[PDB]
């Protein structure tokens, strides 16, 4: 669970 | 990778358009800063700047071709370097002052509001003065910032080095455009890339400081900023 | 002096100014401890620092500096220079760090000291990079000289940058003799100077680790090494 | 400083 994960693949 | 077939001008045009906005501080009350007050503004600004940084990275040629894990790694490693070189670049036309935000222009003495911050302030001001004396161009800045992103965590890969070489060609192409001689071209290239060593150094000092404010629980940090901080393990 | 040297004279001076490769105490009979391994590293470093001082003064342009300026540059870059030397010696020993000809450590041995593995992996990674780039000796002595002059230049200075530009001309001159194209010359130059960023990173990490070992009182540091450590002021 | 003396020698 990474906030950075979500931000990268959502844009 | 579409980044390799890009011309030098197409590389410059891509980086310029990818530029993140200049955000404003959560402060428009003017109220002489305490320690928790200034740390609050910086972290709040950084937490909002980080979001636009991810958008910017994705528009950096060659970064979309990377694994999600590899993308996370490069950002976790250089996010503070990218924030600082942006800070240094905005503060360029403001000698002795740091432009964190258009409504947040801090000098050295305001660095004394936070303990250990003064040493970091002087280093940032020293880099800003260096950029100013070198007359850094915006086209060069967006190259160096992109270089930091791809380079800082690459030894922690052949494609990344191919893009890094491509940005080097872009920097040379810019200097040749400006009318520099071959000798002046590789000299200035060397001058710019050696500044990245200090940008790295300022980040490392900034990490320990940000971590120090975490353990002292001076200012509550966002979970995102807390995740980026944990990626260094201090 | 320094501004009047040819590229070849610059290389010759730096090659001639090279410090010797010292040996570690290390009795292979003696089992490893956290204190033992840290002791070997700090004992070696303390003896290497003396030669580094004499090396620095034989670096073109460094003698022309203020005595206080010389102290500053060495205090901020002593571990960087120690590490880039370690990386260079370990270049032909994949998976191993050549601290000394008789002291060859791998990743697993680094786990004897806590928080050392992370530094070991970085040092090993840099060594692999030098190996991948096939770093020449002439290029190494330049990069090491660049670190000495550049690491603390922002923390007179006109002369320093003039020498730094001179070393850049030297690196370019080296690559041109190697048969590289103008594009390949600038590219490799960039690849080399970006490694110095990582070397800086390993230094700051090594400092915090060395300071950590100091406060934990696992290893007695020499009074010189203690002054070198206080020059950064950490935690 | 120790570094000071050794640089002087
Ligand atoms: O654009 C930027 C916004 C903030 C910062 C920044 N500067 C510091 C200094 C010390 C410290 O502990 C943290 N700092 C941060 C932050 F908040 F980003 F971490 C730099 C550029
Ligand atoms: O030639 C060299 C001698 C020592 C070192 C070195 N490596 C470390 C690693 C961790 C640490 O805490 C200290 N280290 C040192 C020392 F002691 F020199 F500072 C590197 C190259």
β-bridge partners, B149? none
CA distance C202 to C155: 19
Question: What stretch of H or E contains B88?
Answer: helix B68-90
Nearest CA owner, ligand 2 atom 2:
C82
Q: Decide if C70 touches D, using CB distance below 8 A.
A: yes
Nearest CA owner, ligand 2 atom 15:
C41
DSSP character for B222? Answer: P
Q: What angle do CA C83, C85, C88 make, to 5 degrees?
A: 110
Resolution in angstrom units: 2.7
The answer, yes or no, to whether B and A have at least 3 beta-carbon pairs within 8 Å is yes
The answer, yes or no, to whether C and D have at least 3 beta-carbon pairs within 8 Å is yes
Given 3-state DSSP classes, what are the helix, strand and coil percentages for chain D, each rounded to the nearest 5? 80, 0, 20
**Is C202 a pocket residue for ligand 2 (Cβ < 6 Å)?**
no
Q: Decide if C177 touches D, using CB distance below 8 A.
A: no
Query: Do residues A4 and B77 touch, judged by C-beta distance below 8 A?
Result: no
Distance between Cα C67 and ligand 2 center (Å): 26
CA distance B148 to B144: 6
* C74·D3 Cβ contact <8 A: yes
Question: What stretch of H or E contains B176?
Answer: helix B158-178
Q: What is the CA radius of gyration of chain B?
A: 18
Q: What angle do CA C233, D2, D7 make, to 5 degrees?
A: 110
CA distance B158 to B125: 35
CA distance B97 to B108: 7
Q: Which domains does chain B have, with CATH numbers?
A: 1-234 (1.10.565.10)
CA distance B157 to B162: 9
Query: Do residues C96 and C34 touch, judged by C-beta distance below 8 A?
Result: no
- Residues in chain B, total: 234
Question: What stretch of H or E contains B229?
Answer: helix B223-230
Structure tokens at C191: 């690849």
Partners of residue A11 in chain B, C-beta under 8 Å: 54-55, 58
DSSP C8-63: HHHHHHHHHTPPP-------TTSPP-HHHHHHHHHHHHHHHHHHHHHHHTTSTTTT
């Amino acid at each position: 669970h990474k906030i950075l994960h979500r931000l990268l693949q959502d844009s | 990778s579409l980044a390799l077939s890009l011309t030098a001008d197409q590389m410059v045009s891509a980086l310029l358009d990818a530029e993140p906005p200049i955000l404003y501080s959560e402060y428009d009350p003017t109220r002489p800063f305490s320690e928790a007050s200034m740390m609050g503004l910086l972290t709040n600004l950084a937490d909002r700047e980080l979001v636009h940084m991810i958008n910017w990275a994705k528009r950096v040629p060659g970064f979309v071709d990377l694994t999600l894990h590899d993308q996370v790694h490069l950002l976790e490693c250089a996010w503070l370097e990218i924030l600082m070189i942006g800070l240094v670049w905005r503060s360029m036309e403001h000698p002795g002052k740091l432009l964190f935000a258009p409504n947040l222009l801090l000098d050295r003495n305001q660095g004394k509001c936070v303990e250990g911050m003064v040493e970091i302030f002087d280093m940032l001001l020293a880099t800003s003065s260096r950029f100013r004396m070198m007359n850094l161009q915006g086209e060069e800045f967006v190259c160096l910032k992109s270089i930091i992103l791809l380079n800082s965590g690459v030894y922690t890969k052949d494609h990344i080095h191919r893009v890094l070489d491509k940005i080097t060609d872009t920097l040379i192409h810019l200097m040749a455009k400006a009318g520099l001689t071959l000798q002046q071209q590789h000299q200035r290239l060397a001058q710019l890339l050696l500044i990245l060593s200090h940008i790295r150094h300022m980040s490392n000092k900034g990490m320990e400081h940000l971590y120090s404010m975490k353990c002292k629980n001076v200012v509550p940090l966002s979970d995102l900023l807390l995740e980026m901080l944990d990626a260094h393990r201090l």
